[PDB]
Amino acid sequence: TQQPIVTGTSVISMKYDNGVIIAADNLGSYGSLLRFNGVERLIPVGDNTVVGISGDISDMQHIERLLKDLVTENAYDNPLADAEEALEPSYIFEYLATVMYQRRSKMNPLWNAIIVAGVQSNGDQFLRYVNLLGVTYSSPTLATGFGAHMANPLLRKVVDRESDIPKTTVQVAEEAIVNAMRVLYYRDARSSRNFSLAIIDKNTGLTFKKNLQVENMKWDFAKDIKGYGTQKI
Amino acid sequence: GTGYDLSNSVFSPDGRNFQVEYAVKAVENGTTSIGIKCNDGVVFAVEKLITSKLLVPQKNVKIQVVDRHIGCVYSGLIPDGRHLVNRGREEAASFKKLYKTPIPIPAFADRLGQYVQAHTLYNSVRPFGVSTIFGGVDKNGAHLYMLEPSGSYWGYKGAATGKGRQSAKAELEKLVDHHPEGLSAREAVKQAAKIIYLAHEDNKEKDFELEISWCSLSETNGLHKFVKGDLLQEAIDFAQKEIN
Numbered sequence: 114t115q116q117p118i119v120t121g122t123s124v125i126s127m128k129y130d131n132g133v134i135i136a137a138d139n140l141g142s143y144g145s146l147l148r149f150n151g152v153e154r155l156i157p158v159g160d161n162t163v164v165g166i167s168g169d170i171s172d173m174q175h176i177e178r179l180l181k182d183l184v185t186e187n188a189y190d191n192p193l194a195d196a197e198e199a200l201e202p203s204y205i206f207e208y209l210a211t212v213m214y215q216r217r218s219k220m221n222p223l224w225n226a227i228i229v230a231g232v233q234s235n236g237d238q239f240l241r242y243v244n245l246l247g248v249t250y251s252s253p254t255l256a257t258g259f260g261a262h263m264a265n266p267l268l269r270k271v272v273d274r275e276s277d278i279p280k281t282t283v284q285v286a287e288e289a290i291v292n293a294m295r296v297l298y299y300r301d302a303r304s305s306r307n308f309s310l311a312i313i314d315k316n317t318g319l320t321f322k323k324n325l326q327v328e329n330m331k332w333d334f335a336k337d338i339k340g341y342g343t344q345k346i
Numbered sequence: 347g348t349g350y351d352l353s354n355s356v357f358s359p360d361g362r363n364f365q366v367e368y369a370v371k372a373v374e375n376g377t378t379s380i381g382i383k384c385n386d387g388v389v390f391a392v393e394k395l396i397t398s399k400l401l402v403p404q405k406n407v408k409i410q411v412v413d414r415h416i417g418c419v420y421s422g423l424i425p426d427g428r429h430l431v432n433r434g435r436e437e438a439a440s441f442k443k444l445y446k447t448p449i450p451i452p453a454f455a456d457r458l459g460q461y462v463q464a465h466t467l468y469n470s471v472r473p474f475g476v477s478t479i480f481g482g483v484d485k486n487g488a489h490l491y492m493l494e495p496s497g498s499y500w501g502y503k504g505a506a507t508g509k510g511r512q513s514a515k516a517e518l519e520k521l522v523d524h525h526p527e528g529l530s531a532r533e534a535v536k537q538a539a540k541i542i543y544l545a546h547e548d549n550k551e552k553d554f555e556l557e558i559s560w561c562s563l564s565e566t567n568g569l570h571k572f573v574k575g576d577l578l579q580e581a582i583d584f585a586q587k588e589i590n
Contacts, residue, residue, distance in 0.1 A: 182439070185414055189435065192407055192572070 123260035168225030202231030214247025226257035385528035387562030421508035423475030463497025510545025
């Protein structure tokens, strides 16, 4: 039984016709103190799977090692480590899922919410969630924490049901995600202006965008707002 | 008296450990394998005897990697060979986990060294029936190492073990002399294929299959990798040519 200390916020992701997109700002909060700003919370495992982590950073770092190890271990006595026997997103998920539920069952959880996004060997998109309780689920869009409330309603408007995915392009999808990231910047007191975005396309592969920033924010109307009711000046 | 060779930790009257010595027998009897330390990495090669046309070619791989930067090849009792590598893997993992940095070749060497030497200490265990050539690149260059069932090991410029160990050691020494300035990773792969082809004469009865792997700072980014396809055939040729 622990309690998070340094933490990461929302991790949002959805899937389009050819792959999946996932993003998360680069902040490491410590209470209301936005303490660390260079935190990458998007861990790529191989080049067909990106793992987004929110929650306690120290535990996130721990899960990172597990992932990198899982990569090293797979290469062992495996002449097809970068082919037929390379890591699939589904494997990385199940592993994580396993670990997560085991820790909660031991009353010593890994205080995180995780989203594994990627493309299976047969082209299929993979997107699944798992948290410190071991709960898991999938949906055309997935977000953790604050994104579960603000990001989802936005992304769900792009891909409401399954049949929507093949109709969504990387442009559309990426845009939706970029916007959500902004909205989250407006209303999440624990968010940062800088984030990272990853695209896993069954054709273009893994494109990992770093140091993005929320642009085109609306603030001008703020001037016209004075007082809190009757004040006129 | 006698019988000083029936238990593993016993010292003969002249100060030897016959069990260990008998282990070396199991090794010399094995296939031949070498290691060539080039000027920025190490090349590993091994003799794979084709017991029959039934063995799926390119399939029963021998050379093993430890972590991501270390390579292992051994002659003798293969199962003992793997057993050792497993321990090395745990050994390397334990190390990285605490010090973060991937285990230094030297440190790894002694890690395997102490383990092996450990099996010459009790009569309840059998010594390792393998000699192992291993190495890789680390913070300060490349390193080639060979470990004996006795637990003994040293750093080599070139190393060989097994059936054709002499032909090899013969050839390796020639290289060392005709290359005071060093050999390149590319070149060591070739030279290795040749040296394996020559050492194959002390077993010219059964047909074989070559297997090379290297770890070069400039060629593989300090990562251990198997030499395949074109570069491989190219070496098989450079050897096949000089064997005539």
